[PDB]
Amino acid sequence: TGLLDGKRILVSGIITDSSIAFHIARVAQEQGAQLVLTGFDRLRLIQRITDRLPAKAPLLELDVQNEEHLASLAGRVTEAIGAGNKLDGVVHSIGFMPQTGMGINPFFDAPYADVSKGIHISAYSYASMAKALLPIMNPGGSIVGMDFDPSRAMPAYNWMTVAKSALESVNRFVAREAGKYGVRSNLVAAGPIRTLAMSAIVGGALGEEAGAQIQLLEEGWDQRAPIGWNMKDATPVAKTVCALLSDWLPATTGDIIYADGGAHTQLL
């Protein structure tokens, strides 16, 4: 039976059925986890999407930029899972960068307000979610966030790369706080995944140069990866998250696990 059996896990970041978060939730549920889901803004759409998951699960609202949503999140979760119960797991699968700081726009022409909003949502929110939810987490529990390796610069990704560099630093401090509760904190640095958003870029929505750049990155990724890399398949990364959520990596924290086919270990 299941890898996450009898675990209570909060999963953020579902927006479509091609969301990495969607697959994380699916696999987790397939593995016996009992879930609490969170969503931003488009709650009617999200509710419809999440009905396509294997099992029923409460959907709660969370705009990570809303100080009231965060302050109330713990109480609202406890209500959904029942009093006298706590969370074993939390999944941060949230990211955003205005098109001004990421894509076709030059690196220098991103105005700070846009940059700041992206860091807020993509990095700081990892800390604020942890603050909100640690008091209602069990020992042995696990917090997991989604990363994209920012240790080297690349075209297009631009300020989102900077946000991921920030998020990695954030995760190391959150581990310090999380350790006090017997709770681990880690990032999964995933390889490129064809989300709906990504698929549109590949199809030319951000121009032919941008479409060409993403296509070079993907082809080179699969080449470099010793076991290959399938941009269309989010399942291997979801399993990696489930692994970190499980009891089978109990000594790992403040750390980054790479679900990228080994590509980052190879120059070419």
Numbering used by the authors: 2 to 269
The authors write:
Compound screening against purified M. tuberculosis InhA identified three initial hits, AN2918 (6-aryloxy-benzoxaborole), AN3438 (5-aryloxy-benzoxaborole), and AN6534 (7-aryloxy-N-sulfonyldiazaborine), which had inhibitory concentration (IC50) values against the enzyme of 44, 12, and 79 μM, respectively. AN3438 and AN6534 had activity against whole-cell M. tuberculosis with IC90 of 16 and 36 μM, respectively. To understand the binding mechanism of these boron-containing inhibitors, co-crystal structures of AN2918 and AN3438 with InhA were solved to 2.5 and 2.55 Å, respectively. (iii) Similar to AN3438, the oxime group of AN12855 forms a hydrogen bond with Glu219 and stabilizes the salt bridge interactions between Arg195 and Glu219. To validate InhA as the target of this series, we isolated six M. tuberculosis strains with resistance against AN3438; the frequency of resistance for AN3438 was 6.5 × 10−7. Whole-genome sequencing of these strains identified single nucleotide polymorphisms (SNPs) in inhA; these were I16T, D148G, P151S, R195Q, I202T, and E219A.
The frontline antitubercular drug isoniazid (INH) targets the mycobacterial enoyl-ACP reductase, InhA. Inhibition of InhA by INH–NAD results in impaired synthesis of mycolic acids. Here, we report the identification of the diazaborines as a new class of direct InhA inhibitors.
